[PDB]
RNA sequence: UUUUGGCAUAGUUGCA
């Protein structure tokens, strides 16, 4: 009647991914705690771009939507920052936002780059997370690109940009004993990386009494954050919700 | 035949033709008459030799061409009439070749057979294994389709553009294509799709889209209206001037803002208008004045991206105002693959919503199973499936039709070697609960185009206002808005109702009411 | 045009009650909690985790329209356990088996990054 | 003078004739544009290419919307001259009719 | 509701795997057309030698179409039905059909196997050329492909002439589409206007707005067609 | 001396509901034990349901003759 | 000329007399939506708020009708105008004398059409009684009309970019006559050939047809989620 | 202005006697998409005329091998009459005779 | 009330007055400059 | 017009990839190599960079209207 | 000598190549023009 | 301080 003793295995850790695993779990927590890396995890990204001057090829929302997707460091500010919508200001003061400066004039005949190493923070520990950079747009002789941009906090539902997750490879039951899925041909299918079989099965022998358990993930962060700050975050927002959900039934049952 | 061969005192445009049955010889020069190249066989050999494929691999710093290939006797246009005297060979590898013969006295031979289509029915991959009224139906989407137009939009100033953010140019593509530009203009994206029923949101010829995708600029567009207008002066019976309409010195208005406008009654670029904000302030003098400036259409919404300003043809200052509207897919907006495949977003969902594979991939669209199975649209799978193996090989696949090197079990056989299901299945999870979806999903990329028929340009609806000023009836005019028709066949079918009250509030109380006095003893209206 | 705003599918706005519960009359010990603005994320833990009760007799969810934000969990139980107490006690099991993961996720990445 | 010719666009006697593509981004015209049509008023005008049936050959038919059994029509047109076709038939009475 | 929920477990699709055959179906399939082609030239030999002698009530060029398109017809049904026996349950174009979801029976046979004869107004491909369909053939040629018999499947893919005559097939739909939509309405609007204004009368008679009687009682019986069904008399067929 | 059936018909039904309910609209008196409704249509519905509807529907037959019938005397369907 | 005036389609007599631009019409795109009732159609929030209903003021909804003409029309649901006893129209987008806005029974309110409005929708061509049926407004966030997927053949629509009209009864008795003749729910079965009209469709169908094969098993929690959607359940689990 | 007039409405023939005048010859260019643009520069219309009556040109004939496009054509009153040029197809401009 | 030559792209303050010509090179199409107003794009 | 930011599929970044990608290609890579090096392994992200047409390129031949 | 049948797919392709060089997709109008 | 609007053509395109 109690919660499961959930067990975890981290088999890889990089500076772009990690991979792990978690057993003795329902398939509920393991897929709600997916759902959650991809769009619950609040980091820091470029809202409200005010242009300035922009007389690029690119109409002026094209270099905002660019500008957009731009992923900024945000491994240990996002947490002490606070929702703009939420703060009490002219919505940018330091506690709710970061901002960003753009001021690129090309004047050489040769073709120039605005890359995202010309987005300049005002503050060090935002900055963007290539700083090859992320080409921006591209300028001719005489041509200028100048903005005013802001960096709120937000997560993934809201709006893609949020996304820190590149790809959350999420997998269980890899030879399919549990028959959770019914191969028509089960010889013609590859063997998923985590299959113990041996080459000469295509799936494990059936399991009436299985359950679902050992769920193997790999989340790939886009930069913003480390991947096992993603995970930690992930868990943490999860737990909050839960908590905030609690604190209202209560307060509804009384 | 040896003369126009030979570039001698026949040119190449002459056909010749000789009924041997009639004994006539019905020589042709006039135009009008349609023709195309054939490659010129001789005792069951071509005459087009290797060293004719070299020099033309030269083509450049050789001065080596098609004209010299004419030139040299080797290829010649055959018109239609003369087709009927000719024996042609579809392809000289097995068509001429020594076997049980068929016909050992070929004329011509064919430089492939792929050229009998268009321009919009050769971007179709794999259109022999469609059923051909798909192939028409794409050859009109694509018409439809939207893209980047032309290189030099941005100083062109049409009534109506649609320009895609993101355009690709094919993963799975055809020969042809290389020779339309399709590859320096595509009008697409390449999109991984799900085949797969789902929600129940993309039944019925709809599409389900991911939300996530589009706010990464997913088949994002930017569509540019272009507005003119030109002050005229017609002898001294009035003259309009452009000028920013004052709310004291004009006595005809509407309740529209003015000051968007600057001093020379004209609306910078960089501004954001409303379905009824003024761009071109134009005053006409009154024999005080009046006011005849133009409003963006109602529905319509955007920022004024360009302004220019010249002198027409008879020297009046006139100017043309494009306004910008970025265009973001939304339920309604149609799609369609290069198969026929026609349809709309019935709904967008977030990643985490999507279905995904084992390693993470959520499709970009899915579509429903349905589509397929009476659409017989066999190509599109084969696309489907090609895509797949190009985009793991690194190589952008071929599509040419009559192409007997490539058929769907050498595309599965490569596609296993990329540890991947040999057809394209895949085991997709759901996004919902995570689960493992029973059946395995066919997914991978294909080539979708977004076609120009936005839900937004074909919304509309109406509770009273413009009237006609004869039948006294609704009526089009400065939008769609003017009501619908409740034409013959509406009336008959509230007939079959027996709904009499609503037939009669339709076609009285709520399309033109009026009363008029009539005398009793007479008939006519007093 | 129509579109609506993104922020408004995890955010209340004025005067909406977060979660909402009402006794259903067709069956006893029955009760349905309508929760606004959220989605399958709780949904199907909370639902799962309900199942794992054994003095539950029914424990289910749907959102009644995915353009909507609500979810409506049903869940009935035996006489002698009440549907709140069991919803409250799945979310206390819940918080727990979160924390306990966030602990030994975090021992893990010690002993890999110490590895 | 006696008038003004339009001109479609990258003839031989458009300015855009046998320009390298860089010309033709100088003066803002782009290379991957056709041409093949002319600008009336500013409007992009082409003109669909009519069909109409051959002249100067004989054509026989079956009519029987008529009275005869045959004909050989020939839209007769003379040679660069003389626009209006002058359309001669000859016809076979149909046997029927007696 | 409850059944596109439960497909979310469940799942449906269609693929490439779907319209595969397996190796054993494809050479079924490839000798029954052998055996076509080649009575179909034993046919097509008859009529040369003048050893085929025409029906009662037909010409010869009609007898010896009738043979040749009834011989495609049982072959293209024939490599049809094999391959339909050649389905597995899994195969979601059979799970599509028999549900009566979508599609049909033939529709699989010309996805697997043949695609079949291609007709323009209900014969075989005209002679447009001097005694040919194409310029790629003899003339007077009555063989199968020559007239627009399409062997390859559309998994197999259409040849040049097939696919051309297919075209040609296809583009007879699209105009009967056209007249069809062009004569939508016409009739209709005919007869609802001849009888817009026959009325069931209070007395459940039938009449026009001049109030003449139509039918004594509507349908012959009084009845509405919503609530009547299909029955059988238990008396009419048994024997004494 | 009334020859026409005694069920009410649909179009009987429809415009008897459609009345009544417009009459409600008006402000008219409720013949029935109405609780809580606002809606002029259920509250006729409800009145239909008890025969409580003061309306007498005058058939035409097709000779010039008509017969009226109470709501109360027909059956609802 | 007075005669061309009168003849031909675009006539008087048969351009705007049988046939006629109407007041209160809408028109879109329709997609599908399975978690509306067949009786239900989706509605974009901008053709409700631009489209309205005359609601006549009574004791029971004054309060109602009030709080509608403080929100006006800026705000969604709310009112365009307000027809006194006298006949006289007050607009609500520019007037904001507090005066103009009492109510008082015998008042009118062409208050924006909500959520439960009967509406008749329709697909040109209209070719027998369902192809126009009642519906229930039901506002979703959107920019086309959402349909149930089961009324798709009667109106013999498809998904494929396909409009369709929907026609607002302005009255309280067209309104009770589309609730008693024109609601879907009472067109299920036609009277052209004594069967539904409607069935179940493509997806659903397979699925079903998939659901209800003999090994088809389903575990407990399956079931219960399933039976969420049942909406007409009595709320007692059946014994496995 | 008589070219222009003509190029500007499509209307060919003798301006004042344009009732009988044959439409849609010129037409504005479709700038859409590119493919959209070269489908429109190649593009054949077939009259109707008394000729299109007596034998049906809808229908796709097999001269149209390699000269036209087998499937391209807009839907509706206009499948078959309005056709796309192959894509190697050359329309002879002719010559004399001499 | 300044323009911007499409040709040489010279600023020129040009009245509503007088007809539209560029003052050092004679082309005659010209476009409107820039507006200064705040101009903000969410970078959704 | 311009290489995309993200992946649009799994929202990989892919705007910092462009120039390396061409200039792989300038060292004689097949395009399967060329993708492996700059390490896109799943075929989503392979897809942008594989099917990218940079137009912008041909945008800025055109003099600017300053 | 002569090009063997596993040659011809690039040769033909080539050809046409060669022919959209020289010609381009607009001869029609063009050429008709000049006349 | 409460307006509004060109008619008739021709072409193209969407759905049935
Ligand atoms: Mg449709
Ligand atoms: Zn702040
Ligand atoms: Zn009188
Ligand atoms: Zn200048
Ligand atoms: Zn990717």
Redesign the interface.
């Given at each position: 009647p109690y919660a499961n003793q959930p067990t975890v295995r981290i088999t890889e850790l990089t500076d772009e991914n990690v991979k792990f695993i978690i057993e003795n779990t329902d398939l509920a927590v393991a897929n709600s705690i997916r759902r959650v890396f991809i769009a619950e995890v609040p980091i820091i990204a470029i809202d409200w771009v005010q242009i300035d001057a922009n007389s690029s090829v690119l109409h002026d929302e094209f270099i905002a939507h660019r500008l957009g997707l731009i992923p900024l460091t945000s491994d240990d500010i996002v947490d002490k920052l606070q929702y703009s919508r939420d703060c009490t200001c002219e919505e940018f003061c330091p506690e709710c936002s970061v901002e960003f400066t753009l001021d690129v004039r090309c004047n050489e005949d040769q073709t120039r780059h605005v890359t995202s190493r010309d987005l300049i923070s005002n503050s060090p520990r935002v900055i963007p997370v290539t700083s090859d950079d992320i080409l921006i747009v591209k300028l001719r002789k005489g041509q200028e690109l100048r903005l005013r941009a802001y960096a709120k906090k937000g997560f993934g539902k809201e709006h893609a940009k949020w996304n820190p997750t590149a790809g959350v490879a999420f997998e269980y039951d890899p030879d399919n004993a549990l028959r959770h899925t019914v191969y028509p041909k089960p010889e013609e299918w590859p063997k998923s990386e985590y299959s113990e079989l041996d080459e000469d099965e295509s799936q494990a022998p059936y399991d009436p009494n299985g359950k679902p358990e050992r769920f193997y993930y790999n989340v790939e962060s886009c930069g913003s954050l480390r991947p096992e700050t993603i995970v930690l975050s992930a868990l943490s927002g999860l737990k909050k919700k839960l908590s905030d959900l609690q604190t209202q039934l209560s307060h509804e049952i009384q | 035949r040896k003369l126009r061969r030979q570039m001698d005192i026949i040119?190449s445009?002459?056909?010749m033709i000789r009924d041997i049955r009639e004994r006539e010889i019905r020589?042709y020069?006039?135009?009008?008459?349609?023709?195309?190249?054939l490659l010129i066989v001789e005792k069951q050999?071509?005459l087009?030799?290797?060293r004719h494929?070299d020099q033309?691999?030269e083509?450049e710093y050789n001065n080596y061409?098609?004209?010299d290939?004419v030139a040299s006797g080797v290829?010649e246009?055959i018109?239609?009439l003369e087709?009927?005297?000719?024996?042609?060979?579809?392809?000289?590898?097995?068509?001429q070749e020594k076997e049980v013969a068929?016909?050992s006295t070929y004329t011509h031979c064919?430089?492939?057979?792929s050229?009998?289509?268009?321009?919009?029915?050769?971007?179709i991959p794999?259109?022999?294994?469609?059923?051909?009224?798909r192939?028409?139906?794409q050859?009109?989407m694509?018409?439809?389709?939207?893209?980047?137009?032309?290189?030099?939009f941005?100083?062109?100033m049409?009534t109506?553009?649609?320009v895609?953010?993101?355009?690709?140019?094919?993963?799975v593509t055809t020969?042809?294509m290389?020779?339309?530009?399709?590859?320096?203009?595509?009008?697409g994206?390449?999109?991984?799709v799900?085949?797969?029923?789902?929600?129940?949101?993309?039944?019925?010829?709809?599409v389900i889209m991911?939300?996530?995708?589009v706010?990464?600029?997913?088949f994002?567009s930017?569509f540019y209206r272009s507005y003119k207008e030109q002050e005229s002066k017609k002898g001294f019976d009035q003259e309009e001037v452009?000028?920013k309409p004052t709310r004291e010195t004009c006595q005809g208005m509407r309740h529209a803002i003015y000051d968007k406008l600057?001093?020379?009654?004209?609306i910078?670029?960089?501004?954001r208008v409303s379905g009824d904000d003024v761009i071109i302030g134009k005053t006409v003098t009154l024999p005080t004045k009046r006011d005849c400036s133009t409003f963006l259409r109602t529905?319509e919404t955007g920022?004024v991206?360009?302004?220019?300003?010249?002198?027409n043809?008879e020297?009046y200052?006139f100017c043309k105002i494009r306004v910008?509207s970025?265009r973001?897919p939304?339920?309604?907006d149609?799609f369609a693959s290069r198969h026929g495949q026609?349809?709309?977003?019935?709904?967008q969902?977030?990643?985490?919503?999507m279905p995904?594979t084992?390693?993470?991939?959520?499709?970009?669209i899915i579509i429903?199973?349905?589509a397929?199975?009476?659409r017989?649209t066999?190509?599109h799978?084969?696309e489907c499936?090609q895509?797949?193996v190009?985009?793991?090989?690194?190589?952008?696949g071929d599509a040419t039709?009559?192409?007997d090197?490539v058929?769907?079990q050498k595309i599965?056989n490569l596609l296993?070697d990329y540890?991947?299901?040999?057809?394209?299945?895949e085991?997709?999870?759901?996004?919902?609960?995570?689960?493992?979806?029973?059946?395995?999903?066919?997914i991978g990329?294909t080539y979708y185009q977004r076609?120009?028929?936005m839900?937004?340009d074909?919304?509309?609806?109406?509770?009273?206002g413009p009237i006609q000023i004869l039948?006294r009836?609704?009526?089009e005019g400065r939008s769609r808005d003017?009501?619908?028709?409740?034409?013959?066949?509406?009336?008959?079918?509230?007939?079959?109702?027996?709904?009499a009250?609503?037939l009669r509030?339709?076609?009285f109380?709520?399309?033109?009411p009026y009363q008029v006095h009539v005398c009793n003893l007479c008939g006519i209206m007093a | 045009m129509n579109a609506p705003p993104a922020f408004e599918s995890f955010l209340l706005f004025e005067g909406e009650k977060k979660i909402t519960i009402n006794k259903d009359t067709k069956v006893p010990n029955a009760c349905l909690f309508t929760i606004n603005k959220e989605d399958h994320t709780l949904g199907n833990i909370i639902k799962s985790q309900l199942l794992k009760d054994p003095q539950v007799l029914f424990a289910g969810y749907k959102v009644p329209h995915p353009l909507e934000h609500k979810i409506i969990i049903r869940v009935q139980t035996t006489p002698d356990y009440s549907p709140q107490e069991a919803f409250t006690n799945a979310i206390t099991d819940l918080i727990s088996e979160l924390s306990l993961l966030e602990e030994r996720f975090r021992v893990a990445i010690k002993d890999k990054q110490e590895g | 003078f006696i008038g003004k010719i339009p001109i479609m666009l990258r003839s031989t006697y458009c300015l855009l004739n046998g320009l390298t593509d860089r010309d033709l981004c100088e003066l803002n015209e782009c290379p991957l544009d056709p041409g093949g049509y002319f600008i009336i008023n500013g409007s992009e005008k082409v003109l669909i290419a009519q069909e109409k049936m051959a002249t100067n050959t004989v054509y026989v038919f079956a009519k029987k919307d008529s009275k005869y059994a045959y004909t050989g029509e020939c839209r007769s047109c003379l040679e660069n001259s003389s626009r209006p076709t002058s359309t001669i038939w000859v016809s076979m009475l149909a046997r029927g009719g007696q | 509701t409850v059944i596109n929920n439960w497909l979310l477990i469940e799942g449906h699709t269609i693929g490439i795997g779907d319209s595969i055959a397996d190796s054993k179906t494809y050479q079924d399939i490839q000798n029954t057309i052998k055996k076509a082609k080649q009575d179909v030239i034993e046919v097509i030999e008859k009529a040369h030698n003048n050893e085929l002698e025409p029906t009662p009530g037909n010409t010869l060029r009609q007898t010896f179409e009738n043979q040749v398109n009834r011989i495609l017809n049982d072959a293209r049904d024939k490599t049809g039905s094999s391959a339909q026996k050649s389905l597995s349950e899994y195969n979601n174009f059979k799970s599509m059909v028999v549900s009566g979801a979508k599609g049909s029976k033939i529709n699989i046979s010309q996805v697997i196997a043949v695609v079949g004869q291609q007709n323009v107004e209900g014969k075989r491909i005209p002679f447009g050329f001097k005694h040919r369909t194409l310029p790629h053939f003899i003339k007077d040629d009555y063989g199968p492909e020559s007239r627009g018999f399409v062997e390859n499947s559309y998994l197999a893919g259409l040849t040049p002439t097939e696919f051309f005559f297919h075209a040609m097939g296809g583009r007879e739909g699209l105009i009967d589409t056209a007249v069809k939509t062009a004569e939508t309405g016409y009739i209709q609007r005919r007869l609802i206007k001849s009888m817009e204004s026959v009325m069931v009368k209070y007395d459940a008679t039938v009449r026009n707005s001049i109030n003449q009687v139509v039918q004594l009682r509507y349908g012959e019986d009084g009845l509405a067609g919503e609530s009547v069904e299909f029955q059988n008399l238990a008396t009419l067929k048994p024997s004494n | 001396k009334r020859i026409t059936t005694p069920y009410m018909t649909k179009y009987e039904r429809a415009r008897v509901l459609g009345t009544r309910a417009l009459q409600i609209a008006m402000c008219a008196p409720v013949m029935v034990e109405l609780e809580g409704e606002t809606d002029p249509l259920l509250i006729a519905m409800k009145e239909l349901k008890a025969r409580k509807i003061p309306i007498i529907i005058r058939r035409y037959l097709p000779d010039g003759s008509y017969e009226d019938w109470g709501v109360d005397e027909l059956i609802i369907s | 000329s007075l005669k061309q005036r009168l003849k031909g389609k675009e006539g008087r007599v048969r351009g705007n007399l049988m046939g006629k631009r109407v007041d209160f019409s809408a028109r879109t795109v329709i997609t599908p939506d399975p978690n509306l009732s067949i009786d239900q159609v989706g509605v974009p929030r901008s053709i409700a708020a631009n489209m309205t209903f005359a609601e006549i003021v009574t004791p029971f909804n004054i309060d109602r009708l009030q709080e509608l003409v403080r929100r006006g029309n800026s705000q969604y649901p709310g009112a365009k105008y307000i027809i006194r006893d006298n006949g006289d129209r007050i607009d609500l987008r520019f007037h904001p004398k507090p005066s103009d806005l009492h109510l008082q029974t015998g008042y009118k309110v062409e208050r924006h059409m909500c959520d439960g409005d009967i509406v008749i929708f329709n697909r040109q061509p209209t070719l027998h009684k369902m192809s126009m049926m009642g519906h229930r407004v039901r506002i979703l966030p959107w920019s086309t009309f959402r349909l149930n997927l089961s009324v798709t053949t009667p109106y013999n629509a498809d998904f494929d970019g396909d409009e369709m009209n929907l026609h607002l009864p302005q009255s309280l008795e067209t309104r009770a006559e589309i609730q008693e003749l024109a609601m879907v729910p009472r067109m299920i079965v036609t009277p052209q050939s004594n069967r539904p009209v409607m069935g179940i469709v493509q997806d659903t169908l397979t699925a079903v047809r998939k659901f209800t094969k003999r090994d088809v098993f389903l575990e407990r929690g399956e079931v219960m989620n399933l039976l969420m959607f049942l909406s007409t359940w009595d709320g007692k689990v059946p014994q496995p | 202005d008589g070219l222009k007039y003509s190029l500007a409405t499509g209307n060919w023939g003798d301006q004042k006697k344009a009732h009988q005048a044959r439409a849609g010859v010129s037409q504005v260019l479709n700038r859409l998409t590119f493919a959209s643009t070269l489908s429109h520069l190649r593009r054949l219309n077939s009259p109707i005329g008394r000729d299109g009556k007596l034998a049906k040109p809808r229908q796709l004939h097999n001269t149209l091998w390699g000269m036209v496009c087998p499937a391209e054509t807009p839907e509706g009153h206009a499948v078959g009459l309005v056709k796309n040029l192959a894509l190697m197809a050359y329309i002879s401009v002719g010559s004399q005779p001499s | 009330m300044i323009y911007i030559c499409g040709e040489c792209h010279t600023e020129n303050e040009i009245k509503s007055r007088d007809p539209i010509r560029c003052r050092e090179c004679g082309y005659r199409i010209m476009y409107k400059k820039r507006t200064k107003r705040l101009v903000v794009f969410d970078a959704r | 017009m311009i290489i995309p930011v993200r992946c649009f599929t799994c929202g990989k970044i892919v705007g910092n990839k462009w120039e390396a990608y061409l200039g792989l290609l300038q060292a004689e890579y097949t395009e399967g190599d060329a993708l492996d090096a700059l390490g896109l392994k799943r075929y989503c992200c392979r897809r942008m960079l594989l099917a990218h047409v940079d137009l912008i390129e041909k945008l800025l031949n055109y003099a600017p209207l300053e | 000598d002569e090009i063997t049948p596993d040659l011809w797919q690039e040769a033909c392709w080539i050809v046409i190549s060669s022919y959209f060089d020289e010609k381009g997709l607009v001869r029609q109008q063009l050429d008709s023009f000049d006349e």
């Open positions: - | 040119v445009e002459v056909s020589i020069t006039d135009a009008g008459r349609i023709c195309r190249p050999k071509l087009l030799k290797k494929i033309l691999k083509r061409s098609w004209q290939l290829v246009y018109d239609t087709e009927e005297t000719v024996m042609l060979a579809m392809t000289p590898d097995d068509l068929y016909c064919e430089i492939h057979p050229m009998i289509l268009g321009v919009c029915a050769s971007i794999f259109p022999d294994h469609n059923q051909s009224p192939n028409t139906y050859s009109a694509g018409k439809q389709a939207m893209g980047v137009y032309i290189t030099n941005h100083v062109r049409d109506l553009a649609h895609l953010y993101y355009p690709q140019k094919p993963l020969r042809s290389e020779y339309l530009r399709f590859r320096e203009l595509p009008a994206i390449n999109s991984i799900a085949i797969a029923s789902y929600t129940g949101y993309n039944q019925e010829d709809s991911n939300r996530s995708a706010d990464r600029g997913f994002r930017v452009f000028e600057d001093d020379d009654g004209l910078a670029p960089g501004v529905s920022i991206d360009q302004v220019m300003v010249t002198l043809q020297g200052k910008r970025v973001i939304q339920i309604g149609k026609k349809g709309t977003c019935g709904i969902y977030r990643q985490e919503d995904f084992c390693e993470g991939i959520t499709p970009d429903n199973p349905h397929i199975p009476s017989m066999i190509g799978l084969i499936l895509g797949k190009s985009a793991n090989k690194g190589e952008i039709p009559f192409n090197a058929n769907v599965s296993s540890g991947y299901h040999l057809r394209g299945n085991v997709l999870y759901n996004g919902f609960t995570g689960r493992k979806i029973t059946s395995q999903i066919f990329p076609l120009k028929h839900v937004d074909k919304i509309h609806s109406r509770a009273r039948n009836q609704p009526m003017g009501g619908l028709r409740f034409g013959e066949m509406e009336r008959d079918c509230q007939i079959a109702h027996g709904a009250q609503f509030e339709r076609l109380e709520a399309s033109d | - | - | - | - | - | - | - | - | -």
